């Protein structure tokens, strides 16, 4: 089965029997996608076990997969198992169960629902400053992902459920240990039904239990029309069950906690290593919001440099790393035959650092996204939230929540490196995009 | 154990209680046919069972059958039950799915047009003479005759010459390798725990596929795989089954491995199906001497002085069409028709979930007492033009129905009728006591007799 790309005439690294090219993952997905981008060119292919993966870098071809032929050919991502009751999650669902869930959860982040969350988020922005003030008045490096993670958890648990959870919170402790042996499912695709029909999962049964019974506890009502109320009103009318309702809550809680804090930690590292960017960003926040005025919905979208700082960080650190779609039937997009079953992959990390696009890609330059220069970026090359009908459904919520946190913090504190601050920042050579050592920074009050 | 074993309980559809893991496969000890017969009597028009964990919905309503086979073929009921491990034979037209089958069906449909079929009558007429002489040596002696052997040799010669233009069996050669390999090409026996465990535990399929394990034996596939490669003799044609695939190959297209996959399907179907039905027909003609005489009287009336059969005289013989149809009613060699419900639908007021296998019990419907008077009896008068109006084409489906019916139906009807004519022109058939009367069907997988059909041959 390892002679597919040889048949189609698509280049790529030579696969080993059974393993394929997974031995090249010792450096991580990022370095493997970048080495293959320079060694082979615009299009290459490799094998995750027996699964052929076609990597495309042409923006016209990326648009065809993500946007044009989404509902027809490239609808679902790579099959992930063994899951179990998590097969009904919107990020894992396929075809019609996804389309019905995509439509059900889309009204969660409209321009009106997002504008309702500003006063709710404004409460936790003050606790974020007070907790940073205690570690700033006393000389002590601050683990940013811990203090940012506690803020991100309270935001998503209130904007989606209205419940207040307020250092050893069992939600943060259980949500974080969804973080080895996946080397086997990449090589054993036939062992998925062995664990599926037998009811075996990858997620530990306790991180699911704590959340499965917490949603059944927050569901006690007795609102505000939030992420939980949208799923209850349709439940009281195919339809959603008490198990699928829990499956969506785990996705929103994990995405609101882990993705928000990790990007915020990456932003503060770039601001500390570039004091000229942090100082210039602080001057814009003070101008739009004088006297430390509370940030509102409209004042956030007004700040251009704040949007340029977030965009450049998401360019350097795209937490998704890759974009993937499963070719459901034989197609010939942009004059290139793609058989059914091939996983079409877009190397987002490798494309965000392509020298043939970004001048000095390893450099942190927020001026790439200025309105003078944001005309020279391709929306299918810079894809930190994906694209098409199956992009990030919470892109607008994530961008607003992180900017509200960056405003409230940069109004009161400046961030400097420490002795133990890992400069330059080393990315985790493992699976997900994270720093090797935790991000520690000195917090000086203003 | 269960997982799905509550589906038909949820839908209110009756059926036998399934055992954990096994489902209802324990009830297959009597075969497909006797199990479908008892279920149709016990549970009525619609019932469901479980081939392991696979829910199977059996339908008997002609309108609902028409919706599955004809109306909703391209949109819902396109593919058959997934059969594995097949390996490279996945590209076979009878096994292909979705667009691949759609491209193959259109590619192979011009094989059996009325023009192409009429061109085959002179070719078949040659082997009809060898069939008589081979039957004559055994006729001059009171020695019994195993009809599956002599009809299988005739069928193998017709399928190799009309599809590839190659003569392999030169008057026999009774040790011909094409017949020896096609014989053991596939043997679905419930006894063999292989096909048993495949149904009970289907997650073993991707294991055997990557293990290069195939339900078709290696030595049999190799013999046919290299024979087709040998069967390519161009430059040297005549536009047959092989030429239609060669011409489209020299223009996606069909690879030298898919071209072999279709040949194996046509070779087996032309050898096994034609010879089996011919043996079933001759058994009924011997056990009913009144039908055999009336058939011989019509053949002599249309073809006097043993005139050679032509494409038009075959379609003229009405009683010959009645005998072939009544035998196909009693012995539908497929037994069942199956389609996989690719998405949730509600046909004729009945919800069918995605993944359920909708099955049409052709054997049970052909013997349904609420349609056929004396269904177990061999009465060709059911198909007379006086009575053929009272026959629902969705109850009597020996070749299936819809876009994915038997693509070689008209070829099989012509090839068998061309054989019955030339045989009955020169011989009459009688039982032998060693002939199993009544004919017991094989309680195993496929529709076959227990003891082979043997008959006495008398010349005229
Ligand atoms: C900086 C923050 C975030 C980034 C960079 C990010 C990025 C992404 C990307 C690249 C995808 C896949 C897009 C594609 O395949 O085309 C995705 C999917 C998704 N994201 Fe996010 N995300 C972020 C935060 C969030 C948050 C806060 C939520 C809250 C609910 C969320 C919910 C989802 C969901 C549900 C999906 C799957 C949607 C679907 O498959 O239909 N994400 N995200
Ligand atoms: C008395 C002889 C035969 C009978 C009763 C018979 C019966 C059937 C039946 C019931 C089906 C399934 C129809 C359905 O599922 O709706 C079928 C399919 C098929 N038959 Fe036959 N058959 C016979 C001979 C032949 C011959 C001689 C060929 C030569 C090529 C052939 C080739 C096929 C093929 C290729 C299919 C699959 C059709 C598809 O998937 O499109 N059969 N047959
Ligand atoms: O990485 C694979 N699949 C991916 C994993 S699904 C994954 C399952 C899961 C993991 C951890 C905690 C809770 C649930 C999942 O729901 N995450 C989306 C939820 C959070 C998020 C993150 C980033 C952006 N927005 C949202 C599919 C995917 C969907 C959307 C964005 C990124 C990735 C993979 C790799 C090799 C072989 N097979 C599968
Ligand atoms: O019987 C199963 N599948 C069958 C598909 S495979 C089966 C595999 C095979 C066997 C022998 C030689 C070569 C290939 C196959 O190609 N035969 C059809 C080819 C010859 C034929 C027979 C009768 C009428 N015309 C044509 C269903 C079927 C389709 C079309 C016609 C007849 C039957 C089955 C049973 C249990 C579980 N799963 C599947």
Straight-line distance from the first to the last Cα atom of chain A, in angstroms, rounded to the nearest whole number: 62
**Close Cβ partners of B367 (under 8 Å, ≥ 6 residues apart):** B37, B330, B375, B376
Q: Does B206 touch chain A (CB under 8 A)?
A: yes
Please return the burial class of A250, using the count of CB atoms within 10 Å of its CB with bins 0-12, 13-18 and 19+. buried
Sign of CA dihedral A156, A160, A162, A168: negative
Cα of A203 to ligand 3 centre, how many Å?
12
Distance of alpha carbon B307 from alpha carbon A129, whole angstroms:
106
Q: Which neighbouring-strand residues pair with A16?
A: A20
3-class secondary-structure state, position A95:
helix
- Determination technique used: X-ray
Mutate to test the pocket of ligand 4, among B83, B397, B408 (most ligand atoms within 8 A of CB): B83
| Beta strands, E only, A98-163 | 142-143
3-state helix, strand and coil shares in percent for chain A, rounded to the nearest 5 = 50, 10, 40
How far apart are alpha carbons A1 and B196 in whole angstroms?
Answer: 27
User: 3-class DSSP state for residue A47?
Assistant: strand
| CA–CA dist A341, A338 (Å, integer) | 9
Name residue, tokens 């009878």. Answer: B94
For residue B327, give the nearest of B360, B294, B285 by alpha carbon.
B285
Measure the CA–CA gap between A295 and A122, rounded to whole angstroms: 8
Burial of A148 (0-12, 13-18, 19+ CB in 10 A): buried
Residue A117, exposed/middle/buried by CB under 10 A (0-12, 13-18, 19+)?
buried
Listed in sequence order, the DSSP H helices in A219-274 are 227-235, 244-254, 260-273
Q: Provide the H-helix boundaries in B90-232.
A: 98-108, 114-119, 121-139, 147-164, 177-183, 193-200, 205-210, 218-230
Output the CA B281–ligand 3 centroid distance in Å.
62
Distance in angstroms (rounded) separating the CA atoms of residues A239 and A191: 31
Query: Chain-centre distance of CA B393, in angstroms?
Result: 17
Answer yes or no: is the C-beta of B337 below 6 A from any ligand 2 atom. Answer: yes
| Spatial contact of B71 and B354, defined as CB atoms under 8 Å apart | no
- Whether the CB of B211 is below 8 Å from some CB of chain A: the reply is no
Name which of A197, A198, A337 to mutate to probe chain B: the one with the most chain B Cβ atoms within 10 A of its Cβ: A197
Structure tokens belonging to residue A173: 């402790």
> Are A262 and A314 contacting, i.e. CB atoms less than 8 angstroms apart?
no
Question: Distance between CA atoms of B250 and B371, rounded to whole angstroms?
Answer: 51
Which residue out of A86, A381, A394, A432 has the highest number of ligand 1 atoms within 8 Å of its CB and is therefore the one to mutate? A394
What is the Cα–Cα distance from A232 to B129, expressed in whole angstroms? 79
Question: What would the DSSP string read from start to end of A335-366?
Answer: TEEE-TT-EEEE-HHHHTT-TTTSSSTTS--G
- Across-strand partners of A444? A414
- Helices B258-268 & B218-230 angle (0-180, nearest 10): 110
Which residues of A, range 112-171, sit inside 8 Å of B by Cβ?
none
Contact of A193 with chain B, judged by CB distance below 8 Å, is answered with: yes
Per-residue buried b or exposed e for A343-354, using 16+ beta carbons within 10 Å of the residue's own CB: bbbbbbbbbbbe
Domain ranges in chain B are 1-460
- Give the angle A285-A290-A296 at the CA atoms, nearest 5°: 65
Breaks (C-N over 2.5 A) in chain B follow: 236, 251
Facing A197 at nearest CB: one of B203, B206, B210: B203
With a 6 Å cutoff on the Cβ, whether A178 touches ligand 3 is yes
Q: What's the token pair of residue B222?
A: 């190799």
A54 - beta bridge partners? A45, A344
Supply the DSSP symbol for B23.
Answer: B
Q: Which residue has the tokens 């404004």?
A: A122
C-alpha to C-alpha distance for A246 and B34, rounded to whole angstroms = 47
Q: Extract the tokens encoding B73.
A: 């073929």
Q: In the structure encoding, which two tokens stand for residue A137, read together? A: 């008045």
Restricting to B residues 48-77, those with a Cβ less than 8 Å away from any Cβ of A are 53
Binding site of B for heme, by residue number, is 406
| Sequence-separated (6 or more) residues with CB below 8 Å from residue B211 | none
Instruction: For ligand 4, atom 20, name the residue with the nearest CA.
Output: B269
List the one residue out of B126, B92, B124 whose CA is nearest residue B107. Answer: B92
Question: Are the C-beta atoms of A234 and A104 separated by less than 8 Å?
Answer: yes
User: How many other C-beta atoms are found inside a 10 Å radius of the C-beta of residue B449?
Assistant: 17
Binding positions of B are: 406
Residue of B nearest to A50 (CA): B210
Q: Is A189 on the interface with B (CB under 8 A)?
A: yes
Q: How far is A179 from chain B (nearest CA, A)?
A: 29
CB A83 within 8 A of CB A202: yes
């Amino acid at each position: 089965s390892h002679g597919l790309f040889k048949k189609l005439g698509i280049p790529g690294p030579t696969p080993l029997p059974f393993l394929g090219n997974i031995l090249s993952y010792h450096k991580g997905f990022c370095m493997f996608d970048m080495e293959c981008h320079k060694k082979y060119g615009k299009v290459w292919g490799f094998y995750d076990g027996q699964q052929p993966v076609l990597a495309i870098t042409d923006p016209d071809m990326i648009k065809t997969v993500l946007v044009k032929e989404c509902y027809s050919v490239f609808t679902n991502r790579r099959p992930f198992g063994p899951v179990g009751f998590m097969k009904s999650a919107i990020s894992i669902a396929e075809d019609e169960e996804w389309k019905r869930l995509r439509s059900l959860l889309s009204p969660t982040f409209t321009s009106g629902k997002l504008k309702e969350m500003v006063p709710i988020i404004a409460q936790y922005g003050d606790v974020l400053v007070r907790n940073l003030r205690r570690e700033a008045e006393t000389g002590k490096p601050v683990t940013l992902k811990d203090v940012f993670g506690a803020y991100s958890m309270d935001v998503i648990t209130s904007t989606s459920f209205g419940v207040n959870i307020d250092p050893q919170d069992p939600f943060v402790e259980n949500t974080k240990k969804l973080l080895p042996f996946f080397l086997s499912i990449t090589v054993f695709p036939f062992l998925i039904p062995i664990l599926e029909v037998l009811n075996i999962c990858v997620f530990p049964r306790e991180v699911t239990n704590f959340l499965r019974k917490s949603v059944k506890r927050m569901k006690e009502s007795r609102h505000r029309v939030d992420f939980l109320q949208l799923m209850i009103d349709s439940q009281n009318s195919k339809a959603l069950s008490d198990l699928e309702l829990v499956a969506q809550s785990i996705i929103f809680i994990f995405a609101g906690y882990e993705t928000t804090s990790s990007v915020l930690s990456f932003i503060m590292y770039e601001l500390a290593t570039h004091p000229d960017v942090q100082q210039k960003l602080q001057e814009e926040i003070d101008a739009v919001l004088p006297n430390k005025a509370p940030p509102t919905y409209d004042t956030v979208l007004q700040m251009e440099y704040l949007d340029m700082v977030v965009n450049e960080t998401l360019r350097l650190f795209p937490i998704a790393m890759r974009l993937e779609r499963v070719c459901k039937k034989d197609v010939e997009i942009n004059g290139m035959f793609i058989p059914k079953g091939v996983v079409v992959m877009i190397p987002s990390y490798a494309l965000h650092r392509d020298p043939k696009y970004w001048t000095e890609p390893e450099k942190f330059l927020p001026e790439r996204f200025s309105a003078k220069n944001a005309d020279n970026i391709d929306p299918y090359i810079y894809t930190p939230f994906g694209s098409g009908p199956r992009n990030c459904i919470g892109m607008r919520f994530a961008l607003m929540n992180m900017k509200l946190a960056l405003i409230r913090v940069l109004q009161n504190f400046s961030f400097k490196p420490c002795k133990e601050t890992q400069i330059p920042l080393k990315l985790s050579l493992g699976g997900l995009l994270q720093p090797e050592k935790p991000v520690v920074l000195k917090v000086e009050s203003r």
